[PDB]
Amino acid sequence: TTKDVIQKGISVVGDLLGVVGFPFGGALVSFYTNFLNTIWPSEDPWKAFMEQVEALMDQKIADYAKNKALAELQGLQNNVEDYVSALSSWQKNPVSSRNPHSQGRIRELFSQAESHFRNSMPSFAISGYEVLFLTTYAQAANTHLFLLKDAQIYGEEWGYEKEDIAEFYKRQLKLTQEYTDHCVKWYNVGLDKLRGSSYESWVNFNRYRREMTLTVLDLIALFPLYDVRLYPKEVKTELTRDVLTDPIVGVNNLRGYGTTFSNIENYIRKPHLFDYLHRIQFHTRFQPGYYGNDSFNYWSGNYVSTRPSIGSNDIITSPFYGNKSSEPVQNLEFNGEKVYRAVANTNLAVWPSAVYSGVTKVEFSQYNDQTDEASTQTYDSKRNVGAVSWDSIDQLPPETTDEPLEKGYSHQLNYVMCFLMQGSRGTIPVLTWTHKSVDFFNMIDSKKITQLPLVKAYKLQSGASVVAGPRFTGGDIIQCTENGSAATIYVTPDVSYSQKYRARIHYASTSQITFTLSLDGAPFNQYYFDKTINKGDTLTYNSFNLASFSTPFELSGNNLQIGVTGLSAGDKVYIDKIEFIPVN
């Protein structure tokens, strides 16, 4: 269900993570001609973004409104196309071309496009349909910002005056805040409009939350990296959040025997440090069928093990989920492997009184970065497997379908839960996946700006917990409630010529505070940081400030430990990311 927008939704975030920050000008047109075919070739990509949010909501956009949202996304096609053609010429054309004629021509093109976005946008926010338009609003907003930054890059070359540029800069700032906050507000509103009580309500809920994460929340997460003044190099970053695929079922209609809403959501992975899949212990049962044929074996329960982010290796293993095994147990080991796909068989037995569905087979496609070669590891119920009915590609497509899927995939499996049906009529398993952009090693690039999310810390102290991020950070954040050391993340430098660095940190504090950075316990950076919220406040874009440390430093260590002081009682610090700016 939905691979049309959910593919364009992952190509755009997968394509935008290269030209994010200050793109080496050659990659900024190597991007924009992918983005003109992904999101702006016709109005076929824009009438799908609508009918996707419509499907998750069971409500309609009227017809006196579903049009003027397409009449504008045509308006914006040309503009954006025409600007990119012009900009591409500008890039190629040797500087013995840059006469006053072509200057004010690209100038007018950029001004056209940017002008038009500013006129269009409220069309994607009309009162009453803000949720249904959300993806359209997002993809547009994202083209508008990504457009606006070009004024900073080429402004002088095109002959815009100091003011002209600086007026664009203030607009990019205000719109980055307004666009982001709009998207979180209305995402949550829609999400809430879908909580219910049945397994049925839940799958719609989760399908909304998955698809909105891929085609909205992942997109806004990159909006502050279009500020090329604050990010004047290329940025190395990652999305740390979870997504759960739809559950694996042998029937469309479970007739109210699916696990209740409360029984799934209150029991899925709560905000946690980042980890990677380590082990799955499959548990198979026997399903006596109506005849000496349909009787089969089904995946009924499991354990899960996951290995924590780098710095620790002492593993985690889950409670038992589901029912214990009546055939022998199967173990697959996933150390060092990245499970870029999952395909599954299901099967059912029709009984005069009831139906019994199960998952009989799951084949796990996987890849290996330590030693470049792809493989498969499979699970077999060992009795009447049936046919494949569930393909994770249909929900987590690849970034691009150019390369083979083990290079161009978009997600790797993180976690496998097993939920029991009502009146043990089966087990429904649920798969959790993370983004391919995550780096196991926590590498600090030597040419680029590096963003290290505090959820990649391997260890938390002084009563520092992991908290639901505010939807625009790309994941969660660390919550400090106490003075003293709060988080410890392991860190991989890429050279050993003493490459000096400056640090910034992206936080939100209720009071003024002091951050201490250390390496292997040696403290190497401290400074005072400004208040940014009042107690009780709900965290919007402006809640988080991004502030530099005074002193350059080298990465002669691996164990970054972050500490907070200044908290009175009832204070909160929220830490999102730590940044590394390579220096001279």
Numbering used by the authors: 61 to 644
Give the published text.
Given that the more positively charged Pos3Aa crystals bound NADH better than Cry3Aa crystals (11.2 ± 0.7 and 6 ± 2 μmol/g, respectively), we decided to explore the use of protein cationization to improve NADH binding by incorporating the highly positively charged and flexible PEI polymer into the crystal. PEI-3A crystals were produced by incubating Cry3Aa crystals with PEI in the presence of EDC/NHS. To elucidate the impact of PEI-cationization on the structure of the Cry3Aa crystals, we took advantage of the fact that in vitro-produced Cry3Aa crystals have the same space group and unit cell as the crystals produced in Bt. SEM and X-ray crystallographic analyses of the in vitro-grown Cry3Aa crystals revealed that the crystal framework was unaffected by PEI-modification. The crystal structure also gave no evidence of an ordered PEI monomer or specific residue for PEI attachment, suggesting that, while the PEI molecules bind to the Asp and Glu residues within the nanochannels of the crystal, they are anchored randomly. Similar to what was observed with the Cry3Aa crystals produced in vivo, confocal microscopy confirmed the labeling of PEI and binding of NADH throughout the in vitro-grown PEI-Cry3Aa crystals. Analysis of the size distribution of soluble PEI polymers remaining after the PEI-labeling reaction of Cry3Aa crystals suggests that the 5 nm diameter nanochannels of Cry3Aa (inset) favor PEI polymers smaller than this size. As expected, while the original Cry3Aa crystals had a zeta potential of −35 mV, PEI-modification led to a change to +45 mV. Notably, PEI-cationization of Cry3Aa crystals was highly effective in promoting high levels of NADH binding (540 ± 6 μmol/g) —an amount that we hypothesized should be sufficient for facilitating NADH-dependent enzyme reactions. We speculate that the nanochannels of the Cry3Aa crystals and the nature of the interior of the channel provide an optimal environment for the binding of PEI and, subsequently, NADH.
